[model samples]
Target: TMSGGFELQPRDGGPRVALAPGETVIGRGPLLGITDKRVSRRHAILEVAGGQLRIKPIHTNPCFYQSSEKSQLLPLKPNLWCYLNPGDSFSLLVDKYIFRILSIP
Candidate 1:
């Protein structure tokens, strides 16, 4: 465990993450749950610890809007909820996949 959150472990040997004063790293857990359920405000905060960022989970349904490259990353753009958490999945319309930044040494 880190100061407050857990350190990220990316399988693909991705870039190591860095934590600025207000920056955060998206560790794990609930990465997919945000989309399947109505994530609570308590559960939706940009997590920061080892060096990564996870936006606060918010209500969204990509399958209802996007088709090409389905993503909540879309709605966030130019939307009021952009400051909130965005959901992602392995498939186009699914949610709850976790991408992360590597921990700094």
Candidate 2:
């Protein structure tokens, strides 16, 4: 069986967070190390399961997602899950806080 996982590389040069099969909270704290004021303490929720990753924006501020490096960013709705694949990227607030998704074996 393929045991795939993901790594969140912060654009701000912070530490990367590895995601496994579970629920992870992404926000302005130790987990993500995001210090932007626009980012809430519990901004978004990342769930990994069944070899897939999904994200849900929990805060009022809108989140943006990019399917690829050259793709246009789309706003994510609050409380709605957005599926993410390898090579996907997302921002907590319109490019201010970016995190690239890297697939791991």
Candidate 3:
């Protein structure tokens, strides 16, 4: 079987996080290097699998997802797992920071 994963590419020029097949908590922490006070300690949860990704919002702050750059962002409902494919992007605070999903082999 092919071992594929996803990468969270930060548009603002920070270290990118490589996501493997597991659950990763995204928030203001050392892993993501996020220092924004508006972001909670545990903002969201990302579950990664080969060729698939699931995101669940844990904070009250709005999480937005966009299929592509040309498409509008839609709010990600809290406590619900949202699916994302490669080339999709999401932001925690809407327009503040953007994380694009990239597939890796």
Candidate 4:
């Protein structure tokens, strides 16, 4: 039961980046590096629209998303868009790295 703006929170003790209704990059390089070799230089891309988060893998590796509200887990296919509804927080996994997506009011 959540609604409002979104934030992409990395688990590496770094600062959380606010997510807008557009595309945001995620990977193992700059901006939000995961420091994991399993993740590509430019891993997945998040597209926020209509209070939902859409993810698309930029590399061959697969990504996954899990909502905190339920047991639903969405898989991100390469070049394919997958969506996550507005929630308190959701988990995004790439390789072994995990990021929490929070809904900010």
Task: Estimate, for each residue in 50-105, the C-alpha lDDT of model 3 and write its tens digit.
Answer: 56898999998978899865587788888899988888988888877788888887
How many clashing pairs does model 4 include? 0
For this target, which candidate reaches the highest lDDT against the unseen true structure?
2
Residue-by-residue lDDT tens digits, candidate 4, 1-105 = 132377767655578877766777777766664577777777778787776777777777677777666554456556887665544233345334556677776
lDDT, model 2, position 22: 79
* TM match of model 4 to true structure: 0.68
lDDT of 1 by residue, 5-88 (tens): 223332234443333445432222343323433333233234453343344333343211222245442333211222211222
Cα-based RMSD of candidate 1 = 12.9
Per-candidate TM-scores read 0.24, 0.86, 0.87, 0.68
Off by over 4 Å in 4: 1-4, 11-14, 70-75, 88-95
**C-alpha RMSD in Å of predicted model 4 compared with the true structure:** 4.8
Clashes of 2: 0
Give the per-residue lDDT digits (tens) of candidate 2, residues 29-90: 87776677888988888988888889999989888899875777789878999988888889
Query: Backbone collision count in every prediction?
Result: 8, 0, 0, 0
Local accuracy by lDDT, each model: 0.32, 0.83, 0.82, 0.65
Off by over 4 Å in 3: 1-4
For candidate 3, give the lDDT.
Answer: 0.82
